[PDB]
Protein backbone atom coordinates (compact mmCIF):
# COMPACT_ATOMS: atom_id res chain seq x y z
CA UNK A 1 0.00 0.00 0.00
CA UNK A 2 3.02 2.22 0.62
CA UNK A 3 4.04 1.53 -2.97
CA UNK A 4 0.60 2.85 -3.92
CA UNK A 5 -1.14 -0.32 -5.10
CA UNK A 6 -4.49 -1.86 -4.13
CA UNK A 7 -3.52 -5.17 -2.51
CA UNK A 8 -5.71 -7.83 -0.88
CA UNK A 9 -4.99 -9.73 2.34
CA UNK A 10 -6.42 -13.12 3.26
CA UNK A 11 -6.02 -14.04 6.91
CA UNK A 12 -6.94 -17.72 7.05
CA UNK A 13 -8.48 -17.84 10.53
CA UNK A 14 -9.34 -14.85 12.70
CA UNK A 15 -10.31 -17.46 15.28
CA UNK A 16 -6.89 -19.11 15.50
CA UNK A 17 -5.42 -15.60 15.77
CA UNK A 18 -7.35 -14.69 18.91
CA UNK A 19 -7.11 -18.25 20.23
CA UNK A 20 -3.35 -18.41 19.75
CA UNK A 21 -3.23 -15.03 21.47
CA UNK A 22 -5.11 -16.68 24.32
CA UNK A 23 -2.37 -19.24 24.94
CA UNK A 24 0.24 -16.49 25.10
CA UNK A 25 -1.67 -14.51 27.73
CA UNK A 26 -2.28 -17.78 29.57
CA UNK A 27 1.24 -19.07 30.18
CA UNK A 28 2.30 -15.43 30.50
CA UNK A 29 0.23 -15.36 33.67
CA UNK A 30 -2.47 -12.82 32.79
CA UNK A 31 -5.90 -13.06 34.44
CA UNK A 32 -8.47 -14.61 32.08
CA UNK A 33 -11.72 -12.84 31.21
CA UNK A 34 -14.70 -13.66 29.00
CA UNK A 35 -14.65 -17.43 28.57
CA UNK A 36 -10.95 -17.51 29.47
CA UNK A 37 -9.85 -15.28 26.60
CA UNK A 38 -6.96 -12.86 27.06
CA UNK A 39 -7.82 -9.67 28.99
CA UNK A 40 -6.65 -7.76 25.90
CA UNK A 41 -8.61 -9.58 23.19
CA UNK A 42 -10.22 -6.30 22.12
CA UNK A 43 -6.95 -4.43 21.57
CA UNK A 44 -5.18 -7.34 19.87
CA UNK A 45 -7.98 -7.54 17.32
CA UNK A 46 -7.98 -3.75 17.31
CA UNK A 47 -4.49 -3.20 15.92
CA UNK A 48 -4.56 -6.14 13.52
CA UNK A 49 -7.78 -4.81 12.03
CA UNK A 50 -7.05 -1.08 12.07
CA UNK A 51 -3.98 -0.88 9.83
CA UNK A 52 -6.02 -2.64 7.14
CA UNK A 53 -7.56 0.33 5.31
CA UNK A 54 -7.43 2.60 2.24
CA UNK A 55 -4.69 5.21 2.74
CA UNK A 56 -4.26 8.40 0.70
CA UNK A 57 -1.52 6.68 -1.31
CA UNK A 58 -2.87 3.14 -1.70
CA UNK A 59 -5.11 0.53 -0.13
CA UNK A 60 -5.19 -2.90 1.47
CA UNK A 61 -8.52 -4.74 1.32
CA UNK A 62 -9.11 -7.89 3.38
CA UNK A 63 -11.26 -11.00 3.35
CA UNK A 64 -10.85 -13.14 6.44
CA UNK A 65 -12.35 -16.48 7.45
CA UNK A 66 -14.23 -16.14 10.73
CA UNK A 67 -14.78 -19.57 12.26
CA UNK A 68 -17.63 -19.82 14.76
CA UNK A 69 -17.14 -22.19 17.72
CA UNK A 70 -20.29 -24.26 18.32
CA UNK A 71 -22.00 -21.95 15.83
CA UNK A 72 -22.31 -19.39 18.61
CA UNK A 73 -21.94 -15.73 17.65
CA UNK A 74 -21.77 -14.72 21.31
CA UNK A 75 -18.37 -16.35 21.78
CA UNK A 76 -15.81 -13.52 22.12
CA UNK A 77 -13.78 -14.64 19.08
CA UNK A 78 -16.26 -13.90 16.27
CA UNK A 79 -17.92 -11.31 18.52
CA UNK A 80 -15.14 -8.72 18.56
CA UNK A 81 -14.60 -9.44 14.86
CA UNK A 82 -18.05 -8.18 13.83
CA UNK A 83 -17.34 -4.57 14.81
CA UNK A 84 -14.72 -4.34 12.06
CA UNK A 85 -16.36 -6.08 9.09
CA UNK A 86 -17.76 -3.94 6.28
CA UNK A 87 -19.52 -6.96 4.82
CA UNK A 88 -20.36 -10.45 6.10
CA UNK A 89 -20.72 -13.51 3.86
CA UNK A 90 -22.34 -16.33 5.82
CA UNK A 91 -21.80 -19.82 4.40
CA UNK A 92 -24.00 -22.79 5.31
CA UNK A 93 -23.18 -26.43 5.97
CA UNK A 94 -26.75 -27.36 5.05
CA UNK A 95 -26.83 -25.36 1.82
CA UNK A 96 -23.65 -27.19 0.85
CA UNK A 97 -25.22 -30.58 1.62
CA UNK A 98 -28.07 -29.89 -0.80
CA UNK A 99 -25.51 -29.43 -3.58
CA UNK A 100 -25.09 -25.65 -3.91
CA UNK A 101 -21.34 -25.02 -3.49
CA UNK A 102 -20.85 -21.32 -3.50
CA UNK A 103 -22.60 -22.29 -0.26
CA UNK A 104 -23.79 -18.88 0.94
CA UNK A 105 -27.19 -17.94 2.38
CA UNK A 106 -28.39 -14.93 0.33
CA UNK A 107 -30.85 -14.03 3.09
CA UNK A 108 -28.30 -13.60 5.90
CA UNK A 109 -25.29 -12.35 3.94
CA UNK A 110 -24.98 -8.59 4.42
CA UNK A 111 -22.95 -5.56 3.40
CA UNK A 112 -22.68 -2.16 5.06
CA UNK A 113 -22.27 -0.97 1.47
CA UNK A 114 -25.36 -2.52 -0.16
CA UNK A 115 -27.42 0.67 -0.41
CA UNK A 116 -28.61 2.31 -3.66
CA UNK A 117 -26.55 5.52 -3.80
CA UNK A 118 -23.41 3.45 -3.25
CA UNK A 119 -23.90 0.60 -5.71
CA UNK A 120 -26.49 2.01 -8.11
CA UNK A 121 -30.23 1.39 -8.14
CA UNK A 122 -30.19 -1.54 -10.55
CA UNK A 123 -27.83 -3.39 -8.22
CA UNK A 124 -29.71 -2.61 -5.00
CA UNK A 125 -33.06 -3.42 -6.62
CA UNK A 126 -32.24 -6.82 -8.15
CA UNK A 127 -30.33 -7.57 -4.96
CA UNK A 128 -33.35 -6.96 -2.72
CA UNK A 129 -35.53 -8.70 -5.30
CA UNK A 130 -33.58 -11.95 -5.12
CA UNK A 131 -33.79 -11.56 -1.37
CA UNK A 132 -37.53 -10.92 -1.56
CA UNK A 133 -38.34 -13.87 -3.81
CA UNK A 134 -36.10 -16.28 -1.91
CA UNK A 135 -38.08 -15.25 1.18
CA UNK A 136 -41.56 -15.70 -0.30
CA UNK A 137 -40.61 -19.21 -1.40
CA UNK A 138 -39.72 -19.94 2.23
CA UNK A 139 -43.25 -18.97 3.29
CA UNK A 140 -44.84 -20.90 0.43
CA UNK A 141 -42.72 -23.92 1.35
CA UNK A 142 -44.86 -24.50 4.43
CA UNK A 143 -48.22 -24.84 2.68
CA UNK A 144 -46.62 -26.90 -0.11
CA UNK A 145 -45.81 -29.75 2.26
CA UNK A 146 -49.03 -29.66 4.27
CA UNK A 147 -51.56 -29.30 1.43
CA UNK A 148 -49.41 -29.84 -1.65
CA UNK A 149 -48.32 -27.86 -4.69
CA UNK A 150 -51.77 -27.87 -6.30
CA UNK A 151 -52.95 -25.29 -3.74
CA UNK A 152 -50.71 -22.42 -4.87
CA UNK A 153 -52.37 -19.87 -7.16
CA UNK A 154 -51.05 -19.75 -10.72
CA UNK A 155 -49.08 -16.67 -9.71
CA UNK A 156 -47.68 -18.42 -6.62
CA UNK A 157 -46.58 -21.65 -8.28
CA UNK A 158 -45.00 -19.24 -10.74
CA UNK A 159 -43.09 -17.49 -7.95
CA UNK A 160 -41.91 -20.88 -6.68
CA UNK A 161 -40.74 -22.03 -10.11
CA UNK A 162 -39.03 -18.69 -10.69
CA UNK A 163 -37.44 -18.74 -7.23
CA UNK A 164 -36.28 -22.33 -7.55
CA UNK A 165 -34.40 -21.22 -10.65
CA UNK A 166 -32.55 -18.25 -9.14
CA UNK A 167 -31.46 -20.50 -6.26
CA UNK A 168 -29.35 -22.67 -8.56
CA UNK A 169 -28.34 -19.69 -10.70
CA UNK A 170 -26.36 -18.13 -7.80
CA UNK A 171 -24.30 -21.28 -7.45
CA UNK A 172 -21.31 -21.65 -9.77
CA UNK A 173 -18.22 -23.80 -10.45
CA UNK A 174 -15.16 -22.20 -8.86
CA UNK A 175 -11.86 -22.43 -10.77
CA UNK A 176 -10.02 -23.77 -7.72
CA UNK A 177 -12.79 -26.37 -7.48
CA UNK A 178 -11.85 -28.37 -10.59
CA UNK A 179 -9.71 -30.74 -8.53
CA UNK A 180 -13.06 -31.76 -7.02
CA UNK A 181 -15.79 -31.62 -9.68
CA UNK A 182 -13.81 -31.66 -12.93
CA UNK A 183 -16.17 -29.18 -14.60
CA UNK A 184 -14.62 -25.93 -15.88
CA UNK A 185 -14.81 -22.97 -13.50
CA UNK A 186 -16.21 -19.64 -14.70
CA UNK A 187 -15.73 -15.96 -13.83
CA UNK A 188 -18.81 -13.74 -14.03
CA UNK A 189 -18.96 -9.94 -14.06
CA UNK A 190 -21.12 -7.75 -11.83
CA UNK A 191 -23.07 -6.56 -14.87
CA UNK A 192 -23.61 -10.06 -16.25
CA UNK A 193 -24.86 -11.19 -12.84
CA UNK A 194 -27.35 -8.35 -12.42
CA UNK A 195 -28.34 -8.74 -16.06
CA UNK A 196 -28.93 -12.41 -15.28
CA UNK A 197 -30.88 -12.31 -12.03
CA UNK A 198 -32.99 -9.32 -13.04
CA UNK A 199 -34.20 -11.10 -16.16
CA UNK A 200 -34.56 -14.57 -14.64
CA UNK A 201 -37.08 -13.06 -12.23
CA UNK A 202 -38.94 -10.62 -14.48
CA UNK A 203 -38.85 -13.15 -15.96
CA UNK A 204 -37.76 -14.10 -19.47
CA UNK A 205 -36.22 -17.54 -18.93
CA UNK A 206 -39.41 -19.23 -17.74
CA UNK A 207 -39.40 -21.57 -20.74
CA UNK A 208 -36.25 -23.45 -19.68
CA UNK A 209 -35.88 -26.14 -16.96
CA UNK A 210 -34.14 -25.36 -13.65
CA UNK A 211 -31.06 -27.44 -14.44
CA UNK A 212 -30.06 -24.84 -17.03
CA UNK A 213 -29.18 -22.51 -14.17
CA UNK A 214 -27.46 -25.12 -12.00
CA UNK A 215 -23.75 -24.45 -12.58
CA UNK A 216 -23.04 -21.73 -15.16
CA UNK A 217 -21.72 -18.26 -15.91
CA UNK A 218 -24.23 -15.61 -16.99
CA UNK A 219 -27.59 -16.98 -18.17
CA UNK A 220 -26.12 -16.75 -21.68
CA UNK A 221 -24.53 -20.09 -20.81
CA UNK A 222 -27.64 -21.26 -18.97
CA UNK A 223 -29.72 -20.92 -22.13
CA UNK A 224 -27.09 -22.93 -23.98
CA UNK A 225 -27.15 -25.79 -21.49
CA UNK A 226 -30.93 -25.47 -21.71
CA UNK A 227 -30.78 -26.47 -25.37
CA UNK A 228 -28.87 -29.65 -24.52
CA UNK A 229 -31.26 -30.07 -21.60
Amino acid sequence: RDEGRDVLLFVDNIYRYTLAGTEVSALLGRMPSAVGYQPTLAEEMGVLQERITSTKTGSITSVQAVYVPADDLTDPSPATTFAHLDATVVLSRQIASLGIYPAVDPLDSTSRQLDPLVVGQEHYDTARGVQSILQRYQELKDIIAILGMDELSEEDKLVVARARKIQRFLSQPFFVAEVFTGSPGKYVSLKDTIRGFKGIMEGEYDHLPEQAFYMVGSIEEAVEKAKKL
Binding site: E139, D142, I143, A145, I146, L147, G148, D150, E151
Partner: protein, 69 residues
Protein backbone atom coordinates in the same frame (compact mmCIF):
# COMPACT_ATOMS: atom_id res chain seq x y z
CA UNK B 1 -94.64 -27.62 -3.38
CA UNK B 2 -97.82 -25.56 -3.30
CA UNK B 3 -100.21 -25.96 -0.37
CA UNK B 4 -103.02 -23.99 1.32
CA UNK B 5 -101.55 -20.50 1.69
CA UNK B 6 -97.90 -21.39 1.14
CA UNK B 7 -95.54 -22.43 -1.66
CA UNK B 8 -91.92 -23.46 -1.24
CA UNK B 9 -89.25 -24.27 -3.81
CA UNK B 10 -86.91 -26.97 -2.50
CA UNK B 11 -83.96 -26.28 -4.78
CA UNK B 12 -81.08 -28.62 -5.57
CA UNK B 13 -77.64 -27.09 -4.98
CA UNK B 14 -76.32 -28.66 -8.19
CA UNK B 15 -77.82 -30.34 -11.26
CA UNK B 16 -79.03 -33.77 -10.16
CA UNK B 17 -79.73 -36.85 -12.27
CA UNK B 18 -79.18 -40.61 -12.28
CA UNK B 19 -76.38 -40.16 -14.81
CA UNK B 20 -74.56 -37.41 -12.91
CA UNK B 21 -75.17 -39.12 -9.56
CA UNK B 22 -73.69 -42.50 -10.49
CA UNK B 23 -70.69 -40.47 -11.64
CA UNK B 24 -70.22 -38.93 -8.19
CA UNK B 25 -70.85 -42.29 -6.54
CA UNK B 26 -68.28 -44.13 -8.65
CA UNK B 27 -65.79 -41.38 -7.81
CA UNK B 28 -66.42 -41.71 -4.08
CA UNK B 29 -65.98 -45.48 -4.30
CA UNK B 30 -62.71 -45.06 -6.19
CA UNK B 31 -61.16 -42.50 -3.84
CA UNK B 32 -61.64 -45.00 -1.03
CA UNK B 33 -60.02 -47.90 -2.90
CA UNK B 34 -56.83 -45.84 -3.03
CA UNK B 35 -55.69 -43.88 0.01
CA UNK B 36 -54.63 -40.59 -1.58
CA UNK B 37 -54.05 -37.09 -0.24
CA UNK B 38 -56.31 -34.11 -0.93
CA UNK B 39 -55.98 -30.54 0.32
CA UNK B 40 -58.57 -29.07 2.66
CA UNK B 41 -59.01 -25.36 2.02
CA UNK B 42 -57.66 -23.99 5.30
CA UNK B 43 -54.32 -22.18 4.95
CA UNK B 44 -54.59 -20.47 8.33
CA UNK B 45 -54.40 -23.95 9.84
CA UNK B 46 -51.81 -25.07 7.30
CA UNK B 47 -48.86 -22.74 7.88
CA UNK B 48 -49.76 -22.47 11.56
CA UNK B 49 -49.75 -26.23 12.14
CA UNK B 50 -46.44 -26.33 10.28
CA UNK B 51 -44.76 -23.65 12.39
CA UNK B 52 -46.20 -25.39 15.43
CA UNK B 53 -44.67 -28.66 14.24
CA UNK B 54 -41.22 -27.15 13.70
CA UNK B 55 -41.23 -25.15 16.94
CA UNK B 56 -42.33 -28.14 19.04
CA UNK B 57 -39.90 -30.53 17.37
CA UNK B 58 -36.55 -31.59 18.83
CA UNK B 59 -37.00 -29.72 22.11
CA UNK B 60 -35.50 -31.70 24.98
CA UNK B 61 -37.87 -29.60 27.09
CA UNK B 62 -39.62 -32.46 28.92
CA UNK B 63 -36.21 -33.85 29.85
CA UNK B 64 -34.67 -30.51 30.85
CA UNK B 65 -37.40 -29.93 33.41
CA UNK B 66 -38.06 -32.78 35.83
CA UNK B 67 -41.56 -33.99 34.99
CA UNK B 68 -43.48 -37.18 35.77
CA UNK B 69 -45.06 -39.20 32.95
Amino acid sequence: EVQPGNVTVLADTAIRGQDLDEARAMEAKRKAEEHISSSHGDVDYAQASAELAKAIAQLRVIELTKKAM
